[PDB]
Amino acid sequence: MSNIVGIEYNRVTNTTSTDFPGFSKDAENEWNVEKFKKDFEVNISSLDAREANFDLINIDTSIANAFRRIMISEVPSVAAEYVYFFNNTSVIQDEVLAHRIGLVPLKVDPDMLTWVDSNLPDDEKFTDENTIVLSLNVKCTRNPDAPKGSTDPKELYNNAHVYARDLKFEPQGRQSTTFADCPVVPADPDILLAKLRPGQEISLKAHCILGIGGDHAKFSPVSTASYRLLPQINILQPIKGESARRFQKCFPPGVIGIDEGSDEAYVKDARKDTVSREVLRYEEFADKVKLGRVRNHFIFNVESAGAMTPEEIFFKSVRILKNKAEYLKNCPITQ
Amino acid sequence: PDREKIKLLTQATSEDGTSASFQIVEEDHTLGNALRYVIMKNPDVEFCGYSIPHPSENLLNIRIQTYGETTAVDALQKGLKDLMDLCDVVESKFTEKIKSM
């Protein structure tokens, strides 16, 4: 039904694009730029440091999904890969600690680093541009004061909690100047890394690196990046009366509204409706409503892990798609 | 010259080249779906689709059949350029919208 996805009570209909020469007699909907250019529209609803709620219109799901996939699993980021242990006397195993450290995200802008070549031995694999070095050492001791006993392991011990803000940047080589106005730091400095009791010490060095989220989920720059189609509610057969309030109660509170004098009901605000199709449970609105979603209108939400900005992440996804298309175009077709 | 990213599967390929199949390394649904969608809007393409033969391997077979006018290779090149132009349009619109704010 013309780019409206029909939301029924037991199925979902009209989910495919159906715009190409071959769908009907008229060979219409052929690709040409300068019509896609006018049709396509970007609305930015809201903006923040680690947040972006923008909105794309008049593209295909086959393109919006490519953007979403690249954003999730193809935009590179920086996280610790190898951990070198000098001393570990905590209950947490060394590999468990290494895994948690690798999961900690780092507020370092990429494009200031380069890709480690894996075809090289260890002693020259890392350089002052490939790698960032983080260090950690904590020694829990008893508390040299006199408080009441049987208290928490916060004032009863010395540095009994190990956080992410305990990892220190150790510049090497040229990094003393380039990183001078932007020292690396965890994006979430309150992450509990370990717990320890007096007499126990941790001491290690981490070698952070550039990485891709398709190889490990620690390298992914987005907490989640996703889109949702725009909901649509068609009202016919005015529902004025005491049934209007019950029809209003079938949706999230700010979605539809009731006119006071007119006593009727109307679609106050979509983009607030989660499609639970509750109105279809009652059979009295069986022929007074027809839910749908616009197949061409995507509502994007992007949450950043902390290194980049969400709009930079989205642009990097688009440019990555374009770059792989360009590289494939330029490759020779070997028979 | 990276003469390994694209292979023309010759057994699938027909004479006169109106129908052909290509093997692309290190690609997946992300590019397969977008390229297939763009190619299907060519007014000369009758058959377009892709598949990933095994989740273990890093491959992507894509099939193109055309009518007589154009060949499969030219249809693929047109689709790639078409996708590039789509990407430039999206890039420019998003950039100018963010610049205005």
Binding site: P76, P110, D111, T114, W115, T309, F315, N323 | -
Partner: peptide, 16 residues
């Protein structure tokens, strides 16, 4: 808000 992509060079997207 800043369109940092037009100014800064992107070494990360450079393929190895």
């Amino acid at each position: 808000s800043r369109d940092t992509w037009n100014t800064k060079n992107m070494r990360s997207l450079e393929p190895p």
